């Protein structure tokens, strides 16, 4: 176990906060506002994305937990991860799919709003035999609101900057793309020293299989559900990329506040494993899509 958690934990928090703020500014500095108003006036992809996220992902997590025979804590963790709003990293990576990026703003907003009022009920309905307690008040709302405001405020600043002085957009963006890139290494190794050794702790065939099959099933089901609704291919790509991703911070905080660290022995690094796996699948799908576009330019 981790004897010390003070190894630049606050420094890590602040450096990731700065990363998110800067990349949000750069991302919002290259996308309009009128298309957002059009999406709000005619909501078609938002509704299907929300129903896929809050009606299939929890169901997929429940079915996977039943099939793979996960323990109570592992089943609860995967269920919480499944019934989670799309993370900011989904917005970060959907730029590579270059698909209807203006829709992603209202997507994140509606996902956060729906999660805020639906996570208690949607987590209580599927908690039959798992965590007989109420669990309604243990879900963090302030964290959801903080994530929401950090996603939106720099996005609004970037939108205003693009609408006012487009000539300044290329200089702040491209250079920013450098700043968010190299600093990633500056924090990537920071994770390696922080995680230490976890090969014999968290790597379990059932947990590995569930963490492999959760984001992949989310991506596939989102894309299929968009396909049967006859949406734009860019819309299908962005819906899939948003429903596949999940927020692991919420699961980490809820598990930490609802159970002592002694009980969650290997589940402490489970959100990190899920994050690594979703990064791997996202990178793989980006490479596949880029190759498919390259072969037919």
């Amino acid at each position, epitope marked *: 176990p981790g004897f010390g958690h003070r190894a630049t934990d606050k420094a890590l928090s602040i450096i990731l906060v700065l990363m998110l703020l800067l990349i949000m500014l750069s991302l919002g500095c290259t996308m309009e506002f009128s298309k957002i108003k059009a999406h709000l006036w005619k909501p078609k992809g938002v509704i299907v994305a929300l129903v896929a996220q809050f009606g299939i992902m929890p169901l997929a997590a429940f079915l996977l937990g039943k099939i793979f*025979h996960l*323990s*109570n804590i592992e089943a609860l963790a995967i269920l919480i991860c499944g019934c989670s709003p799309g993370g900011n990293l989904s917005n970060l990576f959907t730029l590579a799919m270059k698909g209807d990026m203006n829709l992603s703003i209202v997507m994140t907003t509606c996902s956060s709003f729906s999660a805020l009022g639906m996570m208690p009920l949607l987590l209580y309905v599927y908690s039959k*035999g*798992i965590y007989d307690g109420d669990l309604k008040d*243990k879900v963090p709302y302030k964290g959801i609101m903080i994530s929401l405001v950090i996603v939106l405020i720099p996005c609004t600043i970037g939108i205003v900057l693009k609408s006012k002085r487009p000539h300044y957009v290329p200089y702040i963006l491209k250079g920013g793309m450098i700043i968010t890139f190299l600093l990633s290494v500056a924090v990537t190794a920071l994770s390696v020293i922080n995680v230490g050794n976890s090969i014999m702790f968290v790597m379990t065939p059932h947990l590995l299989a569930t963490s492999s099959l959760m984001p992949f099933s989310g991506f596939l089901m989102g894309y299929i559900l968009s396909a049967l609704f006859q949406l734009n291919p860019s819309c299908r790509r962005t819906i899939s990329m948003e429903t596949g991703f999940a927020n692991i911070q919420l699961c980490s905080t809820i598990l930490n506040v609802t*159970f*002592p660290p*002694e009980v969650i022995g290997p589940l402490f690094f489970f959100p990190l494993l899920y994050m690594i796996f979703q990064l791997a699948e996202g990178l793989l799908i980006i490479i596949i899509f880029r190759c498919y576009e390259k072969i037919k330019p």
Partner: antibody
Amino acid sequence: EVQLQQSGPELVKPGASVKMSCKASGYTFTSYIIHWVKQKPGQGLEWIGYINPYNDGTKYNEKFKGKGTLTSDKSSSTAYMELSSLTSEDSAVYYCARSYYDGIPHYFDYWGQGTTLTVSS
Amino acid sequence: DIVMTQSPSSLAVSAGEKVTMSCKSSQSLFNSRTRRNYLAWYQQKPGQSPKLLIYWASTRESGVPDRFTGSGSGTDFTLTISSVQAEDLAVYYCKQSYYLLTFGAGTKLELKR
């Protein structure tokens, strides 16, 4: 190994206002939850409710929801029970038991010595 | 809720003849996700606190005599002793924890005359 210490037999008037103490110092207190079991003389065991010392969550049986009140002290590693409503038929033996709790309590692998509570004039 | 009913509730065995204590519960208290089969068999000697004998209805706690063996699934469970000693005269409750913590009526063992 691990043992549970009970406060000891208590006689109280039907005016209620009694407290029951169970001390557990053989392990990490917050890792396991504490259940309370009531036994009438010759009527078998009966469940009351359990308390989680970590998050201070308590679950009560339907019969004992009105009267039972469970509290925990991490500094003293103790569990306290208050009923505040006693009658002549409430005299019985109360046991405190320790159980693991992953998502559902497993079983009472360790029990207290038992405290006899008498209610009369 | 789930209620447990033990059929015999009273029996006497002298030296070696085996005993069968069975409580049929109410419904199938077997977890589909994990093959745990939540059920616990306890022993309560007179003037003593209850002692745990078997957990998950098939596995026995370390330190108990090997004569105590429990087998069951779904709703039907049985606890049997290969050879009954003078120290096995107690009350067994076959508690369950699948949904809510409920105890059985109890089975009392005596000595035949």
